[PDB]
C-alpha cells in the first residue's frame, strides 16, 4: 500500500517524519511546507503537514490564496526529509 512520512502531531511537531500507511482510496502523497516568517528573517518552528492524497496536484507560485508549497508524489516515502 501507499506509505507516506506522515506525522501523528500537527504542524506543532518538529520533525514531521513518520512511516504511515495511506488509505486504499488514495493513490499519491501530499506535503505542506510554509515557514513561520517568510517576509522577515526569523528562525522558528515552521508549519508543515504531510498527508496522503488521491490526486497529486500543485498550485501556482503566486501563493496569493493560501497556496503554500504543496508537494506530492506517487511513491512510498518518495521524500524522507521534511
From Swiss-Prot:
It comes from the Eukaryota. Changing residue 50 to H: In MDM; reduced expression of the protein; decreased secretion. Keywords: Cytokine, Disease variant, Disulfide bond, Palmoplantar keratoderma, Secreted, Signal. Induction: Regulated by retinoic acid, EGF and IFNG/IFN-gamma. Down-regulated by IL-13 in cultured human bronchial epithelial cells (related to asthmatic condition). Granulocytes. Expressed in skin. Predominantly expressed in the granular layer of skin, notably the acrosyringium. Identified in several biological fluids such as sweat, saliva, tears, plasma and urine. Residues 3-52 form the UPAR/Ly6 domain. GO terms for cellular component: extracellular exosome; extracellular region; extracellular space. One of its GO terms (molecular function) is acetylcholine receptor activator activity. One of its GO terms (biological process) is cell activation. Changing residue 56 to R: In MDM; decreased secretion. Disulfide bonds join 4-29, 7-16, 22-52, 56-72, 73-78. It is found in: Secreted. The keyword Nucleotidyltransferase does not apply. Has an antitumor activity. Was found to be a marker of late differentiation of the skin. Implicated in maintaining the physiological and structural integrity of the keratinocyte layers of the skin. In vitro down-regulates keratinocyte proliferation; the function may involve the proposed role as modulator of nicotinic acetylcholine receptors (nAChRs) activity. In vitro inhibits alpha-7-dependent nAChR currents in an allosteric manner. In T cells may be involved in regulation of intracellular Ca(2+) signaling. Seems to have an immunomodulatory function in the cornea. Homodimer. Interacts with PLAU. Interacts with CHRNA7. It is linked to Mal de Meleda: A rare autosomal recessive skin disorder, characterized by diffuse transgressive palmoplantar keratoderma with keratotic lesions extending onto the dorsa of the hands and the feet (transgrediens). Patients may have hyperhidrosis. Other features include perioral erythema, lichenoid plaques on the knees and the elbows, and nail abnormalities. This is Secreted Ly-6/uPAR-related protein 1. The gene is SLURP1. The chain holds residues 23 to 103 of 103 of the full protein.
Amino acid at each position: 500500500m501507499l506509505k507516506c512520512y506522515t506525522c501523528k502531531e500537527p504542524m506543532t511537531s518538529a520533525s514531521c517524519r513518520t512511516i504511515t500507511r495511506c488509505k486504499p482510496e488514495d493513490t499519491a502523497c501530499m506535503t505542506t511546507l510554509v515557514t513561520v516568517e517568510a517576509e522577515y528573517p526569523f528562525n522558528q518552528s515552521p508549519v508543515v503537514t504531510r498527508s496522503c492524497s488521491s490526486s497529486c496536484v500543485a498550485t501556482d507560485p503566486d501563493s496569493i490564496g493560501a497556496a503554500h508549497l504543496i508537494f506530492c508524489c506517487f511513491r512510498d516515502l518518495c521524500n524522507s526529509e521534511l
